[PDB]
Amino acid sequence: AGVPENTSLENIPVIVSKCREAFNDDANRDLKKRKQVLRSLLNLVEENTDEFCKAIHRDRRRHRDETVVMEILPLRNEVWHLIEHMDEYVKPVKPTMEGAAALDDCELQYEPLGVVLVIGTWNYPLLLILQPLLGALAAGNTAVIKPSELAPATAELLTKLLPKYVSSDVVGIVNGGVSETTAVLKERFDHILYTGSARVAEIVMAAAAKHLTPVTLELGGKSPVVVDDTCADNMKVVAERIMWGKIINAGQTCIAPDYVVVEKSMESVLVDALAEARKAMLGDKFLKVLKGELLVKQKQQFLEESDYPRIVNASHFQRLMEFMKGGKVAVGGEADEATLTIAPTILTNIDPTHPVMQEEIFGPILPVLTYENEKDILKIINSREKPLALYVFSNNKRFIRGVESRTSSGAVVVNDVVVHAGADGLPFGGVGRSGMGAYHGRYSFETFSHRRPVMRRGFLFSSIDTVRFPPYTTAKSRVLNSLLK
Amino acid sequence: AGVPENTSLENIPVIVSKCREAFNDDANRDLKKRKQVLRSLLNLVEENTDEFCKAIHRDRRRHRDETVVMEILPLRNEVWHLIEHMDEYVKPVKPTMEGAAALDDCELQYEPLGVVLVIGTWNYPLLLILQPLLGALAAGNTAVIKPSELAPATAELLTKLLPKYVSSDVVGIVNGGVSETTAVLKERFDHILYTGSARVAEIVMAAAAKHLTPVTLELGGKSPVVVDDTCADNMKVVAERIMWGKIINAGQTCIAPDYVVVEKSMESVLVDALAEARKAMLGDKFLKVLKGELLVKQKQQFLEESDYPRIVNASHFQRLMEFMKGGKVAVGGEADEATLTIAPTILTNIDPTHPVMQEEIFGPILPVLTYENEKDILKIINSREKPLALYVFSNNKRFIRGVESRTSSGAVVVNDVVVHAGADGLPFGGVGRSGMGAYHGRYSFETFSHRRPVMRRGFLFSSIDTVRFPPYTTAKSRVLNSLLK
DSSP, rough: SSSSSOTTTTTHHHHHHHHHHHTTTTTTTHHHHHHHHHHHHHHHHHHTTTHHHHHHHHOOOOOOOHHHHIIHHHHHHHHHHHHHHHHHHSOBBBOOOGGGGSSSSEEEEEEEEEEEEEOOOEEEEEEEHHHHHHHHHHHHEEEEOOOOTTTTHHHHEEEEEEEHHSOOOTTTEEESSHHHHHHHHHHSEEEEEEEEEEHHHHHHHHHHHHHOOOEEEEHHHOOOOEESSOOOGHHHHHHHHHHHHHGGGGGGTTTOOOEEEEEEGGHHHHHHHHHHHHHHHOOOHHHHHHHHOOOOOOHHHHTTSSSSOOSOOOOHHHHHHHHGGGGGEEOOOOOTTTTTTTTEEEEEEEOTTTTTTTTTSSSSSEEEESSSHHHHHHHHHSSSSOOEEEEEEOOOOHHHHHHHHHHSSOOOOEEEESSSGBBTSSSSSSOOGGOOOOOOOOHHHHEEEEEEEEEEOOSSSOOOGGGGGSSSOHHHHHHHHHHHH | OOSOOOOOEEEEEEHHHHHHHHHHHHTTHHHHHHHHHHHHHHHHHHHHHHHHHHHHHHHHHOOOOHHIIIIIHHHHHHHHHHHHHHHHHOOOOOOOOOOGGGEEEEEEEEEEEEEEEEOOSSSSHHHHHHHHHHHHHTTTTEEEEEOTTHHHHHHHHHHHHHHHSOTTTTEEEESSSSSHHHHHSSSSSSSEESSHOOOOOOOHHHHHHHTTTOOEEEEOOOEEEOOOOOOOOOOGHHHHHHHHHHHGGGGTTSSSEEEEEEEEGGGGHHOOOOHHHHHHHOOHHHHHHTTSSSOSSSSHHHHHSSSOOOSSSSHHHHHHHHHHGEEEEEEEOOOEETTEEOEEEESSSSOOTGGGGSSSSOOSEEEEEESSSHHHHHHHHHSSSSSSSSSEEEEEEHHHHHHHHHHOOSOOOESOOSSGGBBBTOOOOOOOOEEEOSSHHHHHHHHTTEEEEEEESSSSSGGGGGGGOOOOOOOHHHHHHHHHO
């Protein structure tokens, strides 16, 4: 089939209710149970790595090795992190107390929230459904997951496999499109994590508002790459890192390099270096066949057998092809509609008001803009929505510090792109229209827990008792007036 | 007049726009500017303490000394905390890194969000508008404040005074009711803090959804007081603390003791002790006059000159009087409609299904329920919404641990009520229908900032470069397959 069966609307309340009852019955309360579930989800990933790569290949045309690097290995590391550090994360923290409260016994405890809803996306369909789930389960919640309908092979496989590793009471699954997503959003959760578009995020948050449910929203935006004039000697590595970040998933990544702002004098060397990096990574034969300079017996079959990922659908393909009109095609521009293939394309001489420099590209088009001074960079970046990532290539500390301190983004990476998402120890999240909240590791545990302050007092007298109790006497007034001036 | 002029709907966009432009022009970016504003707000409170107490007295009939303890002193301590610790809070944190990312230079920086909206409430009308504001300004934001129309004297005075201490570009003010609140909620903010009801919180969060604006919601619920059988010798102090928490603001506090769950054998001694505490705190003459056992020449004038706060309005008064029907009036029940006076009233023999044990009381009615075992306590508490506070009176460690670990609330205090709100070092906030997010001190700074991860790399080779780059060769597959075995 290659598609999961849609969950009936009548079964959606039952699925959520079973997860609710399971939470209430301590199904994931004890740390032993949480570690068992995490270990079982590790087994889910490890025992079925080959078939998941094949399903992801069917959905995305993403090569197995790309999927291993981007999804399988990060998931494995996430499970190991959460199991290894769980005992540390669950313990109460002793906060720094000042004044009268310092004499009492105070703690910050962490407690589970209840049932967490995770709404997945299609571009990394295993990572972006399981990574949030692992965190929610580490914090002692139960969960409902909603796989993206735009990665149906992955959704089918995950739906088939998951019950063999984790109970449906602990992790429920709702499959379908808008109808089923709308329906599950009417049910009451204690937290919702959504990855996807700002448009749909508004709808998710509106639904969450009806139950006063906290939300983590992982969205996108136009992640800029700033390249200054101190990287001439590093230009090959600069171009290789930028081009890699663009080539993965055919540009369809929330932290992909969206556009470049390069120092005026470095434009030619950067563009040439990006062209060389592109040839190296895609290979001569692929490009020649796509260009029409090397014949093959079955061109469409050749492209469907290639190592280069597909655009999600025809609508997104046409949108990306129209974006090429907003500047000069300096490098690339090769495409095949039938196989939804668009090679990485560098645009120069951009009209900044054109849609290509107004909307998140989320594809193989890379606009290149120039700057002369810091003010030019800030005008480009600060006039647009706060992106999930911001990238700066530079060997100059003062330049890097200036760009960091005068911009806002979900993260900053200096001299690389994308790799911060796999970094164990950083919270991953957006700000403004790139989203709210953050997760990964400790930050998943915190996001899917309630930090609950506890103050323990004795029955002895203390400084608060000198003034708090009525009746309001002249003596009390004199005591309080002595504190005031 | 005793009332602020309503902000015209046409001026609301202008007010927000001026604050937005001020933020964009770095009006509160530099720490010098932030400390100047905080010091000026300290001067606002300290120079006008007498007049604020009088305005709050006009609105609430709250005694000056009660206002000093509950609002003035906590605000003073908040400003001192934020000024003293600002340099500590702004500095980057070095996160604990694991795996490949441990070789890179990583930081968690804090940056301002933009413009913060603070919607105040009426019950502590200075504290619950200024305390959030102080935090927002400490984090380098500008702000718009919306004072509650149900504390008009305080709203008028604050609106008059605030521009003399802080610029209208840095702190804008919108005055009015539903029309003006609805209008300001259409404007784009980078964070909204709302204190009030769960009902209106849903409307606030729906408005926030339209701009993907994060929200901190400080709501209410029925904060239970659990009293076990190990406090017989401490029963006077137990009763004094509970009764004080109820008497302040005539019960109209989001963390007031809403109801009591007392061990079966201790019911009589607790109720008697609460009665004695009530007499001590209110005085014999006040109660006698309210009961109608002592005549005075001007009864309504006598009650309006009393030290006991007023119910907010006639509607809330009638609701609280009807709550007395849900059990036996064991202690109190004295009231005067004209002056909106209801004395603290202890109800026994409660019908748990009656509205008095279904809704947040937010008034002088204190239901007393009994328990025999832990299961009885948990059935009462866990069948209701997660309250902002939970209180446990006990000398038994195992009992306290059991109640803490099996309940969820915004906070727990052992052997006291309410006082945790003034504790320097604890985050203050709810969970579920008592709210989301938290603030006070460091936690205000964190709530009104974006924690922004920064990863700095060099141009040298590292372990990620062995596998990330295409082309996807047989050699790469062998390298990645070696990691997956």
